[PDB]
DNA sequence: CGCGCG
DNA sequence: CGCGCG
């Protein structure tokens, strides 16, 4: 599925930038050409998951966990 | 926007200035998403023309 | 301004 | 779940 496309962008994103690196979804939003609110929605999935570690912050920090 | 402006602050005063409602009832009612009907609300809230209510989710009525 | 929300 | 956000 086009979510699941998603989810594996995001991941390998992430895994090349550094597992102990996190950006921001508004950098991942821009870098991947998807709408901000898609990488969002992904990306706190994906924390529930417990695939993704969230930095608590404004704006918040994202990593692979 | 004077458009939807002028509709809500219609029916919240057909409603009754002691009366308060919800973005989401609004949306129903006079048929406009709920995104906009609150880009309007908080609008006219910092206008001083409604009070917003503290709640969740919050309350809107004519000042 | 944090927003992911269906 | 509060969301109005460009």
Same mark, same amino acid.
């Given at each position: 599925?086009?979510?699941?496309?998603?989810?594996?962008?995001? &991941?390998?994103?992430?895994?090349?930038?550094?597992?102990?690196?996190? /950006? /921001?979804?508004?950098?991942?939003?821009?870098?991947?050409? /998807?709408? @901000?609110? =898609?990488?969002?929605?992904?990306?706190?999935? &994906? *924390? @529930?998951?417990?695939?993704?570690?969230? =930095?608590?912050? /404004?704006?918040?920090?994202? @990593?692979? *966990?």
């Amino acid at each position: 599925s086009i979510y699941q496309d998603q989810e594996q962008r995001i &991941l390998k994103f992430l895994e090349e930038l550094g597992e102990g690196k996190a /950006t /921001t979804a508004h950098d991942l939003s821009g870098k991947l050409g /998807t709408p @901000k609110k =898609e990488i969002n929605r992904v990306l706190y999935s &994906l *924390a @529930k998951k417990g695939k993704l570690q969230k =930095e608590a912050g /404004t704006p918040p920090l994202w @990593k692979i *966990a």
